[PDB]
């Protein structure tokens, strides 16, 4: 068994973490267990604290706007490890007890209970080279030695490790995605009828996505092209929450549909990161540091939870758009569009033990 360790620049206090990936179950989040190793000789009268904070970054690292920091703290938890606080009566995890047994008597445990229904670790892709710091939600465990919390702490006396709060695909598949849209232009005849569906709701990263398109064009308007695209929606929730949109994959076929006819076809799409390196603000999965990441997994939320959850909430949809040729007595190059949306889930399969 191996555990992660990090030491302060002065090398006096070091903190031990069993793992750096914490699974976010909908009902509860896995506890953040760890042990900090200190020494009474260095700390004459100070008390060491461990703080777990959730940092959300609004914009670029440089302020350049009245000198204010675009960095919100969505959740901050604090605990006094040494001396052992008689206030908290939390038990000891088996990993924590093993760490205490392995380390000396100068090792003290800390545990964090992350409340449920919080944003996961998501980082926004900066696209072209503009900034040196990432932008997004992340979690970090910091342990520092100080006299009291309301005090500036030197960077030489504090450790800090980024941790990931991740979610995995649900063990059971859901209802098959399906969308329908009927449209008539000038009440000529029976309306155009578009039907689209996906083979399954939950897809994993790198798997192809099969879109079953079925069109019965009963009107007199010919369909020029059919465009299938996968779009990533990032609910960047804040004061006056907004919506970010980005086409991750696309396929614009030239399959025409004649009036009073039908056309059924299956289009296979695959969202991957090779062709999406130039899209600024694309939600990534948010690893520890600059490393191999992928498209951010769809955020799972409780159906009976609060809607105004700050951070980034990632979701994916498949848009099937038919561009119909427009023109009657006067022949122009204008066109109309009939589109449907098929929401699906993009996650990682649960690791097998």
């Amino acid at each position, epitope marked *: 068994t191996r555990v992660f360790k990090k030491a302060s620049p002065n090398g006096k206090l070091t903190v031990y973490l069993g793992k750096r990936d914490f699974v976010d179950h909908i009902d509860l989040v896995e506890p953040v267990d760890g042990v900090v190793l200190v020494d009474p000789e260095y700390l004459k009268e100070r008390r060491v604290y461990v703080t777990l904070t959730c940092a959300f970054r609004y914009g670029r690292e440089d302020l350049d706007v009245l000198g204010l920091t675009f960095r919100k703290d969505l959740f901050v938890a604090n605990v006094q490890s040494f001396p052992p606080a008689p206030e908290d009566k939390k038990p000891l995890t088996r990993l924590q007890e093993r760490l205490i047994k392995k380390l000396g008597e100068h090792a003290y445990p800390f545990t964090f209970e992350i409340p449920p229904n919080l944003p996961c670790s998501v980082t926004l892709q900066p696209g072209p080279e503009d900034t040196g710091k990432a932008c997004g939600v992340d979690y970090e465990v910091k342990a520092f030695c100080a006299e009291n919390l309301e005090e500036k702490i030197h960077k030489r006396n504090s450790v800090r490790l980024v941790i990931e709060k991740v979610q995995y695909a649900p063990e059971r598949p859901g209802p098959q995605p399906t969308a329908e849209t009927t449209r008539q232009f000038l009440m000529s005849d029976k309306p155009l009828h578009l039907e689209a569906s996906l083979d399954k709701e939950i897809y994993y990263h790198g798997e*192809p996505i099969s879109v079953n398109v079925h069109v019965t064009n009963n009107t007199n308007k010919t369909v020029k092209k059919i465009k299938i695209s996968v779009r990533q929606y990032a609910d960047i929730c804040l004061f006056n929450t907004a919506q970010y949109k980005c086409p991750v994959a696309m396929e614009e076929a030239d399959d025409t549909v004649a009036p009073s006819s039908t056309f059924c076809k299956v289009y296979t799409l695959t969202p991957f990161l090779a*062709n999406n390196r130039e899209k600024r603000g694309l939600a990534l999965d948010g690893k520890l540091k600059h490393e191999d990441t992928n498209l951010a997994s769809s955020t799972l939320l409780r159906e009976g939870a609060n809607r105004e959850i700050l951070g980034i909430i990632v979701s994916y949809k498949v848009k099937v758009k038919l561009v119909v040729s427009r023109g009657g007595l006067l022949g122009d190059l204008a066109s109309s569009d009939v589109a449907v949306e098929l929401p699906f889930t993009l996650m990682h399969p649960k690791p097998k033990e």
Partner: antibody
Amino acid sequence: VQLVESGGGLVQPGGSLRLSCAASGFNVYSSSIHWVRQAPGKGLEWVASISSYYGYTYYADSVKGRFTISADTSKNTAYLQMNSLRAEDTAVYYCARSRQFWYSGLDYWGQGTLVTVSS
Amino acid sequence: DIQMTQSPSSLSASVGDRVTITCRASQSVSSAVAWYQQKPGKAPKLLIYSASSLYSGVPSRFSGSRSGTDFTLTISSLQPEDFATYYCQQYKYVPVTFGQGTKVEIKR
């Protein structure tokens, strides 16, 4: 679930050859493709690798500039163009598959095709 | 570049005996060590990954472990079908480097 290799044979020093590795049952984006060669009476040596999810491409220090690996995602096949085939390239080339996300070893390996570059 | 020292280069055991194969890494790889088995005239077959996790379909008699930069593959009860060449790879950094290869033969 299967990897099939083809395109190996007798080559002359300085010639060119192209190996094809057709992947059946795997997705080229959810899995990375690796090429490992085994010299006659020797051990395994990694040659090249391609990651279609990221577009990354790696080669061994002894094959850089000469060997080129690519992938045709439509047919789920990977190609390895080998230019300036030196005499030390006599080996059996295996095409292997590993999970693109959270690499966990070479799960599937092909039967391998012998490439002889004798003059 | 990391060079893995697989020892011994060749050993002779019998059916039912316990066999240990050692693999030492030059640099420090965390757990990215995999063990493969190759029979003469056949492609290699993955046996263990992450230096401790057993691959699906591999008999339970194979077992891996790590002690610092010293990895070990252990066969509790050698079988007549478990006599082949075993390699030791390290996929922590690119390039991925394999071991020299340990060849297991029957003892007489």
